[PDB]
Amino acid sequence: MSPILGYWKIKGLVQPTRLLLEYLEEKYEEHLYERDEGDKWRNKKFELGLEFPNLPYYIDGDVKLTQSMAIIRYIADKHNMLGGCPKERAEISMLEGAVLDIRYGVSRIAYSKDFETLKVDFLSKLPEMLKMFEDRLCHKTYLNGDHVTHPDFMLYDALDVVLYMDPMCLDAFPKLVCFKKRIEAIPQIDKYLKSSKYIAWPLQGWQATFGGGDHP
């Protein structure tokens, strides 16, 4: 049967994974927990056969997984996209980590009552983080070269998110601007982003001071 991907009906930690699945054109069903289905999840949490019960989870005829990163890596690995040798795989793991520093950098302050104050500090450090990627993309179409890897969708998600926080944070980074457009230019992605499956909001959990709520 078709693999089952479970998570809240938000972008959050699973969006990059959804994009990788669409890009690979893999078939899959989603168990989406609405903002008021917290209890629905609780009563099912310890009943899915998961060794480390959590959201997101990925269940398919061969495995039962939790931990967003093990999930996206599993999907990529099943398609030989993790790297052909130790060095390459490390490059790709390094790219994941660097993207997470930005994505997690947002979530870390998005649930605070003093978001604006934290935001200033954050938007103050973001430029140096972005420049590392800008330089990475100066002589590359995608993060790992001519071919797409899962970090590309992670970066895309992170850029999508920081753009909501500051629509001008990419003004000094033309390569990153083109990269985001380039990802949206991928047929499978453009199709998915225009379909009824696409969850455009919220970015974080509904209760978040930033990227939360039921509407943009």
Q: Which lies closer to its own copies via its Cβ, residue 16 or residue 186?
A: 16
CB of 107 to ligand GTS, least distance (A): 7
What residues between 178 and 207 interact with ligand GTS by CB under 6 A? Answer: 205
| CA pair distance 75, 34, nearest whole angstrom | 25
- Work out the end-to-end distance of the chain between its first and last CA atoms, rounded to an integer number of angstroms: 35
Q: Which does 175 bind (CB under 5 to 8 A by kind): ligand GTS, its own copies, none?
A: none
Place of tokens 């990802």: 183
Task: Give the contact letters, 32-71, x = binds to its own copies (CB under 8 A), - = no.
Answer: -------------------xxxx-------xx-xxxxxxx
Please tell me whether residue 213 binds ligand GTS under the rule CB under 6 A: no
Q: Does the annotation flag 11 for ligand binding?
A: no
Binding-site member from 5, 13, 20, 183 for ligand GTS (CB under 6 A): 13
Instruction: Give the full edge-to-edge strand order of the sheet including 63-66.
Output: 29-33, 4-8, 57-60, 63-66
| CA pair distance 110, 127, nearest whole angstrom | 18
Binding-site member from 11, 18, 73, 180 for its own copies (CB under 8 A): 73
Please tell me whether residue 103 binds its own copies under the rule CB under 8 A: no
Please tell me whether residue 212 binds ligand GTS under the rule CB under 6 A: no
* Mutual angle of helices 86-107 and 115-136, in 10-degree steps: 160
What residues between 76 and 135 interact with ligand GTS by CB under 6 A? Answer: 97, 101
Residue-wise burial string across 9-44, b where 16 or more C-beta atoms lie within 10 A, e elsewhere: ebbbbbbbbbbbbbbbeeebebbebeeeeeeebeeb
Q: Which lies closer to its own copies via its Cβ, residue 3 or residue 189?
A: 3
Q: Is the peptide bond before 202 cis (omega within 30 degrees of 0)?
A: yes
Question: Which positions lie near its own copies, rule CB under 8 A?
Answer: 51-54, 62-63, 65-71, 73-74, 77-78, 82, 86-87, 89-91, 93-94, 96-98, 101, 108, 132, 135-136
Question: Which positions lie near ligand GTS, rule CB under 6 A?
Answer: 8, 12-13, 45, 54-56, 67-69, 97, 101, 205
